[PDB]
Amino acid sequence: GIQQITNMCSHLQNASRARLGLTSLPNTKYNLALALALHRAGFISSITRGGPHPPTPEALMTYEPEPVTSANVATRRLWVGLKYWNEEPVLKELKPISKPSRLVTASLEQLNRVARGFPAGYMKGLQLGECLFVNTDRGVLEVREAVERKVGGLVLCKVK
Amino acid sequence: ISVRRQKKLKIKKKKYKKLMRRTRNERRKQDRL
Amino acid sequence: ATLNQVMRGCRKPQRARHAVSPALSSIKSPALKGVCVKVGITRPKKPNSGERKTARVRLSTGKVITAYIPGEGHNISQHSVVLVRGGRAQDCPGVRYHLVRGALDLAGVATRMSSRSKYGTKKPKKAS
Amino acid sequence: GKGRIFQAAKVYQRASEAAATNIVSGLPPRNPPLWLKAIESIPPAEINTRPYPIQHSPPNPRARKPRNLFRPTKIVYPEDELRRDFYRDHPWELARPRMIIELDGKDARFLDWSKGLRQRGIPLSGESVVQRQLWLMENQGMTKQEAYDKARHEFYKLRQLEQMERRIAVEEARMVGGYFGKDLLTVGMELENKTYESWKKWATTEIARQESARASMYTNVVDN
RNA sequence: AAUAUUUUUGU
RNA sequence: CGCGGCUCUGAUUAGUGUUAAGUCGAAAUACGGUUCGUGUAGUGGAAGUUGCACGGGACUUAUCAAUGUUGAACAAUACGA
RNA sequence: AAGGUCAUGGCUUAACAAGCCAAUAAUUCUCUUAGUCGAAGCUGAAAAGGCUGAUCGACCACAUUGGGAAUGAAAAAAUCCCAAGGCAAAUAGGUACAGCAGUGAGGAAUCUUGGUCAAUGGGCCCACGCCUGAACUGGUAACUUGGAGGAAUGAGACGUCGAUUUAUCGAGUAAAAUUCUGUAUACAUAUUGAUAAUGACAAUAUGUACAUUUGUCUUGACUAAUUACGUGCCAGCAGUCGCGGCAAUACGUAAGAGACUAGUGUUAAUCAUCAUAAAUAGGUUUAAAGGGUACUCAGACGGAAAAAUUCGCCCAAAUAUAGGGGACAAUUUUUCUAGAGUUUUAUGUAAGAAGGUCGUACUCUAGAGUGGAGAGAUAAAAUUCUGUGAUACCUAGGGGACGGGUAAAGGCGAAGGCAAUCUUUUAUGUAAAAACUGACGUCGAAGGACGAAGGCAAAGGGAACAAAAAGGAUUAGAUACCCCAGUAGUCUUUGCAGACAAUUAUGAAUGCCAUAGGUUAGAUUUUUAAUUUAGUCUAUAAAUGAAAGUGUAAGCAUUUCACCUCAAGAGUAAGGCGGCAACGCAGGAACUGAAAUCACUAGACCGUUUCUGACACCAGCAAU
RNA sequence: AUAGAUGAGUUUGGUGAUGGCUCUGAUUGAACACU
Ligand SMILES: [K+]
Ligand SMILES: [K+]
Ligand SMILES: [K+]
Ligand SMILES: [K+]
Ligand SMILES: [K+]
Ligand SMILES: [K+]
Ligand SMILES: [K+]
Ligand SMILES: [K+]
Ligand SMILES: [Mg+2]
Ligand SMILES: [Mg+2]
Ligand SMILES: [Mg+2]
Ligand SMILES: [Mg+2]
Ligand SMILES: [Mg+2]
Ligand SMILES: [Mg+2]
Ligand SMILES: [Mg+2]
Ligand SMILES: [Mg+2]
Ligand SMILES: [Mg+2]
Ligand SMILES: [Mg+2]
Ligand SMILES: [Mg+2]
Ligand SMILES: [Mg+2]
Ligand SMILES: [Mg+2]
Ligand SMILES: [Mg+2]
Ligand SMILES: [Mg+2]
Ligand SMILES: [Mg+2]
Ligand SMILES: [Mg+2]
Ligand SMILES: [Mg+2]
Ligand SMILES: [Mg+2]
Ligand SMILES: [Mg+2]
Ligand SMILES: [Mg+2]
Ligand SMILES: [Mg+2]
Ligand SMILES: [Mg+2]
Ligand SMILES: [Mg+2]
Ligand SMILES: [Mg+2]
Ligand SMILES: [Mg+2]
Ligand SMILES: [Mg+2]
Ligand SMILES: [Mg+2]
Ligand SMILES: [Mg+2]
Ligand SMILES: [Mg+2]
Ligand SMILES: [Mg+2]
Ligand SMILES: [Mg+2]
Ligand SMILES: [Mg+2]
Ligand SMILES: [Mg+2]
Ligand SMILES: [Mg+2]
Ligand SMILES: [Mg+2]
Ligand SMILES: [Mg+2]
Ligand SMILES: [Mg+2]
Ligand SMILES: [Mg+2]
Ligand SMILES: [Mg+2]
Ligand SMILES: [Mg+2]
Ligand SMILES: [Mg+2]
Ligand SMILES: [Mg+2]
Ligand SMILES: [Mg+2]
Ligand SMILES: [Mg+2]
Ligand SMILES: [Mg+2]
Ligand SMILES: [Mg+2]
Ligand SMILES: [Mg+2]
Ligand SMILES: [Mg+2]
Ligand SMILES: [Mg+2]
Ligand SMILES: [Mg+2]
Ligand SMILES: [Mg+2]
Ligand SMILES: [Mg+2]
Ligand SMILES: [Mg+2]
Ligand SMILES: [Mg+2]
Ligand SMILES: [Mg+2]
Ligand SMILES: [Mg+2]
Ligand SMILES: [Mg+2]
Ligand SMILES: [Mg+2]
């Protein structure tokens, strides 16, 4: 549920704050959705699921994970490659919005306003470098992707 | 709460505890216990 | 506070603050008329020193307030109908009102040349 | 926060901006520092980024929530188990001094362990037995014990000749008029004398000192 | 090592 | 007409606020000169003080009788502050 | 089952059944207050913004107060009937200005006892026409808004005024004077408001004519703007901080200066300021504020991979018919094992309870013990003990409660709390592997249970300690601190009671973040010594914080409960609830304020530690 | 509706916080004083 995305937002911050090369996340359908959005946005390096130990860094991309059946699903995990440039992390902040206590849904007319630095609803305008991820019917897109696809949905988190 | 301020509450609760004793019999005559 | 605690009514108004002139603030009136009950003198508190001219007044509503007499020299006494306005003597406890000097019975300072509007003094009409 | 903000990695980015424009608006920027162009194309390396360290041993596969994923692991070789077995069976082999100070690092270039225990550059010690054992055990397909016996007996035949040379070399020199200095046995005894004498001085001094304590226990100041 | 008299006030 | 509620008032009586210039002590802040506070139960003109358990917002404020070493001779073309 | 209805519905009726709604207030009751609403008015950058509920529109109610019916298509009346009081009236049987104007009263405060039905609307009428205090128009008020309210020239009247440097600094292009305009307004003319006709009253256009007031606040800082004299904590000023005690930029005068202007200030009020009740969007270690505890009903929140249903969510509105998209969401179904649980006697362990005991010391009795004058107390003493033989040293019988070492930064329970010992008895928790159930989970208002010491009630016990009461000292006084003695009480059993610095000054829980040095109970191993699980404790990194500091959290996030909204009054009053009582729970307002409050920094002080100087002291001599 | 988000004085020996109060802005079916 949304509780998993919240834990993922905090952990990715703590990992970047600790300047760690690799980071692990529980293998779930929801976490893989946001992870692909961060990777497609350019914040993380790669995503590969594996066991409790990280894959061989030399062959990260070439890593051939084994099938995920009920005999090992309890041990799988998503291994994310963090990014650091110019003595500063690329995923500094991952402030969430939709928490378990309240789910915030935004409309297309509002995302069009938030995409240009103007508040709308329980959100605030996006400034230089910021980024907003929205969970919609077409997957976990970015506010600028959802605005292009003309759809609204559930706001997940804001990335700086 | 500091100790200096706690002594302000200490004097208030004592003077009250001391007052309810003095007027205990008077409050018993009027059925105000 | 959690959203649930707010749903049950945890947000209550802040405790009210006392007004400088309750008799006027309570009924939303700018001024009231009262009969002077006593014209005496009040002493300021620790820092200030002197004899502040005050007047115990019984407003039309019924409240008995203590008003301050501004200016130098007054002509009011027992049973004087005077107009009371808001204000307060910052150094005199209980003196939470002022008296208009161009009021019904209270006269304005005749030897006032500056701020005559504050003391109800007509212009001297020297040339006129 | 006892630390300080160190910006040593951005000395170029900072110096490059301060030298782009002039403080006195309306004039061209003065020449930059002489070092700004030298390291123009030599950026710093990435620091403070914990990677997955090299695993010198198969990590525990049964662990579901493993810790210390960013901790350097211990370097263990197959020889470590052989060194412990040999030197434990030959404890006094450690008394034989061995130099661990390398000359040029090119010592493993002339080591061919198919010839024998005696190699070029390294002394005949418990390591040569280990390296010879590991070779036979791997190449010749011998067991740990079999290879150990073979490599261990070659070590003895070479050490025996070493002790026989010292005895004969001295005896041979005196048969032609060759005299030597003080052997180690004599020098060792002379040193014990100088130390034993110092202990005797300490014993007699303390012994006499204890007599005063024994007499001071009782009181005889009255001189009855 | 186990010792212990009293000693208020300051527009 | 009865009951209940509500407002005003009441001999007598209680608490508290304010007011530089009075009197009596010196409880706290230093080891405040009896460690101070919490609870509870007594007691004293007043602050206070006493028993019982509890807290540190007081003792981490801590700083050697292990008294501190001939740890392999000497001489050489070795060695040379 | 039947009737009724367009149709549906105990809507209606008959016979059976005992159900339906709610459990956290459905239902009912008391008190206080109010006409409701709208971008209608005001206000904010903004929030499902805030406030008001005038003028405008919609809705509700009322027409002196209270109690009522009929007529009619429809009560939708200032009607009608009845009662009471006020005015009037008497055998009468009217009136109630919250209809317009107006009068009195109240109040800080709000208008003409006009004209006309010409226009718009309405009622009556075949028609003409009659009636209209609605309405349209004139009047009063700076209450508000909008506009006018005068522009250009102006240097030698070689004058005047105030300062002072007689020439400096100003009044000052200011004035006078000259050249133009004809603004508000006045008057005339014309058109128009109206047309079938009707004009109460006025607007608009054009022509001609006239150049008409200053007032007020401020002047220490916030806050734009200065001196002089007088006054002397007096008189006074003040929105806040403050000013005034004899050379006051703050008071009162005079002059100058700053600003608004037919207005200007003041008082009152509202919004914003204020993230200052924070849904957006807060916070609770030391500053207001974590509940004593966690089992738990309701209630919020909570895995994996699929499917049905809703069509929630989105396109996406206008409160959108009917559809589309399927990530997420709600109910539900099938599987899964990472959460939470069960089994395999763990080890270890002062959780708890029952029945019993052990021992060191203390105390009591006896042995007409030994011994024969002191003992104990305190800084010193006194009260006190002892010749009726004490203290001291023994013997033999009892009697109560206590828990030495081990012992540690140790451990155990939800907390409170638990430390001699044996038997009996009881729930969690931790390690290692396997197996099993398959989201069964976390938090949790309320209720209930538990809850230290002290206390109340009843019966036991009573050695020791010790509130009270009492005495002896100290002291200026001494209830006190000290001392001689000493009752409740402490202990046992059965109840009440529920307050604590019930503390980690830090609620519980989940996910997550880099190291090191100790330590506790286990596990594994090449059991030497290193890995490792769950705890606890020091010192750090990133970070965080007001800082102190924390750093298995006071960090990054999340869930949920409790609690906080300046000080003081006050955790107080009143009513109520619980209790035998003591007291507990709950819980205001008036009066008075501009501050309360936290951490840190540097000093000073200490009947504070360790030092360093000095006839400071000791000693000696001399002197007063 | 895309220009709309602002501070100041005041606690302390002093610094940094916390937390009020007051001023700055707009307004009234307003009243009063001097005009
Ligand atoms: K301390
Ligand atoms: K759907
Ligand atoms: K005897
Ligand atoms: K435990
Ligand atoms: K005693
Ligand atoms: K109980
Ligand atoms: K540890
Ligand atoms: K009270
Ligand atoms: Mg507090
Ligand atoms: Mg004041
Ligand atoms: Mg003036
Ligand atoms: Mg003035
Ligand atoms: Mg003093
Ligand atoms: Mg009375
Ligand atoms: Mg004391
Ligand atoms: Mg004292
Ligand atoms: Mg003390
Ligand atoms: Mg105490
Ligand atoms: Mg006593
Ligand atoms: Mg202290
Ligand atoms: Mg009303
Ligand atoms: Mg009404
Ligand atoms: Mg009227
Ligand atoms: Mg009337
Ligand atoms: Mg009147
Ligand atoms: Mg008409
Ligand atoms: Mg008509
Ligand atoms: Mg007609
Ligand atoms: Mg004209
Ligand atoms: Mg007509
Ligand atoms: Mg200024
Ligand atoms: Mg001040
Ligand atoms: Mg002045
Ligand atoms: Mg005007
Ligand atoms: Mg607590
Ligand atoms: Mg409680
Ligand atoms: Mg409490
Ligand atoms: Mg659909
Ligand atoms: Mg299953
Ligand atoms: Mg299985
Ligand atoms: Mg499990
Ligand atoms: Mg056991
Ligand atoms: Mg005898
Ligand atoms: Mg016993
Ligand atoms: Mg405890
Ligand atoms: Mg013990
Ligand atoms: Mg629970
Ligand atoms: Mg409860
Ligand atoms: Mg008890
Ligand atoms: Mg008891
Ligand atoms: Mg009893
Ligand atoms: Mg006494
Ligand atoms: Mg007990
Ligand atoms: Mg306790
Ligand atoms: Mg709790
Ligand atoms: Mg412990
Ligand atoms: Mg620490
Ligand atoms: Mg924080
Ligand atoms: Mg309070
Ligand atoms: Mg309470
Ligand atoms: Mg009460
Ligand atoms: Mg200091
Ligand atoms: Mg001297
Ligand atoms: Mg002397
Ligand atoms: Mg003499
Ligand atoms: Mg201070
Ligand atoms: Mg603050």
Curated annotation (Swiss-Prot), chain B:
The chain holds residues 312 to 344 of 344 of the full protein. This is Small ribosomal subunit protein mS38. The lineage of its organism: Eukaryota, Fungi, Dikarya, Ascomycota, Pezizomycotina. Component of the mitochondrial small ribosomal subunit (mt-SSU). Mature N.crassa 74S mitochondrial ribosomes consist of a small (37S) and a large (54S) subunit. The 37S small subunit contains a 16S ribosomal RNA (16S mt-rRNA) and 32 different proteins. The 54S large subunit contains a 23S rRNA (23S mt-rRNA) and 42 different proteins. Disulfide bonds: none annotated. Component of the mitochondrial ribosome (mitoribosome), a dedicated translation machinery responsible for the synthesis of mitochondrial genome-encoded proteins, including at least some of the essential transmembrane subunits of the mitochondrial respiratory chain. The mitoribosomes are attached to the mitochondrial inner membrane and translation products are cotranslationally integrated into the membrane. Transmembrane segments: none annotated. Residues 14-33 are annotated as: Disordered. It is found in: Mitochondrion. Belongs to the mitochondrion-specific ribosomal protein mS38 family. Residues 14-27 have a biased composition (Basic residues).
UniProtKB/Swiss-Prot annotation, chain D:
The keyword Cytoplasm does not apply. Keywords: Mitochondrion, Ribonucleoprotein, Ribosomal protein. The keyword Ribonucleoprotein applies. The lineage of its organism: Eukaryota, Fungi, Dikarya, Ascomycota, Pezizomycotina. Component of the mitochondrial small ribosomal subunit (mt-SSU). Mature N.crassa 74S mitochondrial ribosomes consist of a small (37S) and a large (54S) subunit. The 37S small subunit contains a 16S ribosomal RNA (16S mt-rRNA) and 32 different proteins. The 54S large subunit contains a 23S rRNA (23S mt-rRNA) and 42 different proteins. One of its GO terms (molecular function) is structural constituent of ribosome. This is Small ribosomal subunit protein mS23. It comes from the Eukaryota. Its main location: mitochondrion. Component of the mitochondrial ribosome (mitoribosome), a dedicated translation machinery responsible for the synthesis of mitochondrial genome-encoded proteins, including at least some of the essential transmembrane subunits of the mitochondrial respiratory chain. The mitoribosomes are attached to the mitochondrial inner membrane and translation products are cotranslationally integrated into the membrane. Signal peptide: none annotated. It is found in: Mitochondrion. It comes from Neurospora crassa (strain ATCC 24698 / 74-OR23-1A / CBS 708.71 / DSM 1257 / FGSC 987). InterPro entries: Ribosomal_mS23_fun. GO terms for cellular component: mitochondrial small ribosomal subunit. Belongs to the mitochondrion-specific ribosomal protein mS23 family. It holds the Pfam family MRP-S25.
